[PDB]
């Protein structure tokens, strides 16, 4: 009945003065915009239909046309930034915010979804949705004693839209908006649905991707233990955002990092640092690199949890990006560590893989490795065992690699290699 209409027929129906004809044409538009392959969004926009749909959003007496137009506009807003902008330019934001209070749950859900797409376009539309007052009604939709009474799809859509309100930087979301959203986010972070958990973790990861004051806003809510628990989940879609959030948090101050450690995060890293998903391994090793950049007691907790052998493992075999993160972790470790910690590192077998990685073409990883070797040599000097370390490097085939780097294009690599050769070889 409303299937496979032409845009011409849709226009004729919507331009009729008959609300039922308008409803049928709007539903045909919705079905066109819901097709799997290349929905004709641009044709619908060029036909001038967005203002009509937006006006239909306000037909409180015809809830079906509200729903159909909300769905059509949601799918238009799901397209390119220009198509989302076409929806915003038609006045859709305040109309959808008004629909958030609809007594019909499917209409409220559709408005939530549409605002999620609009905010997901970027920081400008995110902040514009916020300025029009979306957060209060959105959060009111979740003000129930037990989230489990809400329909699963409804709650998932609310969580996703809230996550888009937390997303993007340059600028980051307004501080007052983040403080307004965070308590509901914590509650959602304790929900049992895997998709709600995943999107809540993503929102926290966004909110912690910034300066230390944003991180502090988050960690003062006490969510770090829940994030560690989720770090241990079996569902990769939960572990990925949980790990991103924990890594962001350990980019902060030593005290925030210590909050991560105290919550028991390090005990999860034997599995994370051997995870079959390359992205998990890379992100876990980056997190480790930022933990080894911390205090000597924090390096010591890395040692106690038995993680140095796992760093040697990643450095020995992993995708190259993860090996680069591991090199960074080793260099930070040797920069901040005691002499005893550095000798422990050597005793775990770091030198041979660290030397094998000097065969790489990336200049940055070579510089990182040369810095680490210099630090290890400084510790050896403090112990008077520099000759033993030199022999160690020579047996690995590393002296050849260093003396070869003496002929490298980068000045820093050149000078560092020559300095090592002159002082210790």
């Amino acid at each position: 009945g409303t299937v496979n209409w032409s845009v011409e027929d849709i226009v004729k129906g919507i331009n009729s003065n008959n609300l039922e004809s308008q409803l049928q044409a709007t539903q045909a538009a919705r079905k066109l915009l819901s097709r799997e392959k290349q929905p004709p969004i641009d044709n619908i926009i060029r036909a001038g239909l967005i203002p009509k749909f937006v006006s239909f959003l306000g037909k409180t007496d015809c809830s079906p046309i509200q729903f159909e137009s909300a769905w059509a506009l949601t799918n238009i807003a799901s397209g390119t930034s220009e198509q989302t902008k076409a929806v915003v330019d038609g006045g859709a934001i305040p109309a959808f915010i008004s629909l958030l209070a609809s007594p019909h749950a499917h209409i409220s859900e559709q408005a939530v979804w549409a605002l999620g797409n609009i905010a997901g376009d970027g920081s400008a539309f995110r902040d514009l949705v916020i300025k029009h007052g979306a957060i209060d009604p959105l959060l009111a939709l979740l003000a129930v004693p037990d989230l489990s009474t809400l329909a699963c799809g409804y709650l998932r859509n609310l969580t996703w839209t809230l996550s888009n309100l937390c997303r993007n930087k340059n600028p980051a979301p307004p501080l007052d908006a983040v403080e307004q959203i965070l308590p509901t986010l914590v509650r959602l972070l304790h929900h049992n649905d895997p998709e709600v958990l995943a999107d809540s973790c993503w929102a926290i990861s966004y909110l912690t991707d910034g300066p230390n004051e944003r991180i502090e806003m988050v960690v003062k809510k006490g969510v770090v233990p829940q994030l560690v628990k989720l770090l241990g989940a079996t569902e990769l879609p939960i572990v990925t955002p949980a790990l991103r959030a924990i890594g962001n948090i350990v980019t902060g101050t030593d005290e925030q990092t210590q909050k991560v450690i105290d919550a028991g995060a390090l005990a999860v890293f034997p599995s994370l640092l051997t995870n079959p998903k390359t992205n998990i391994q890379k992100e876990a090793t980056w997190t480790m690199s930022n933990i080894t950049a911390g205090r000597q007691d924090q390096i010591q907790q890395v040692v106690n949890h038995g993680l140095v052998p796992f760093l040697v493992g990643v450095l020995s075999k992993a995708d190259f990006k993860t090996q680069k993160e591991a090199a960074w972790a080793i260099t930070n470790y040797t920069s901040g560590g005691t002499v005893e910690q550095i000798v422990y590192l050597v005793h775990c077998g770091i030198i041979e893989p660290l030397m094998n990685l000097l065969s790489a073409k990336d200049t940055k990883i070579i510089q990182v490795i040369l810095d680490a070797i210099s630090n290890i040599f400084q510790a050896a000097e403090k112990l008077g065992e520099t000759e033993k370390l030199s022999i160690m490097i020579e047996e690995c085939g590393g002296l050849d690699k260093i003396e070869a780097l003496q002929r490298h294009e980068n000045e820093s690599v050149y000078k560092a290699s020559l300095n090592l050769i002159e002082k210790y070889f």
């Binding site: 819901s34 799918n75 979804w113 999620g116 797409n117 997901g120 980019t251 080894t292 260099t331 930070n332």
Partner: peptide, 19 residues
């Protein structure tokens, strides 16, 4: 030894079409 922040996301827009 300084902390290193995460790389900028290359996914700049997050939108969902309702099928």
């Amino acid at each position: 030894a300084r902390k290193r922040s995460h790389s900028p996301t290359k996914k700049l827009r997050y939108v969902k079409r309702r099928f």
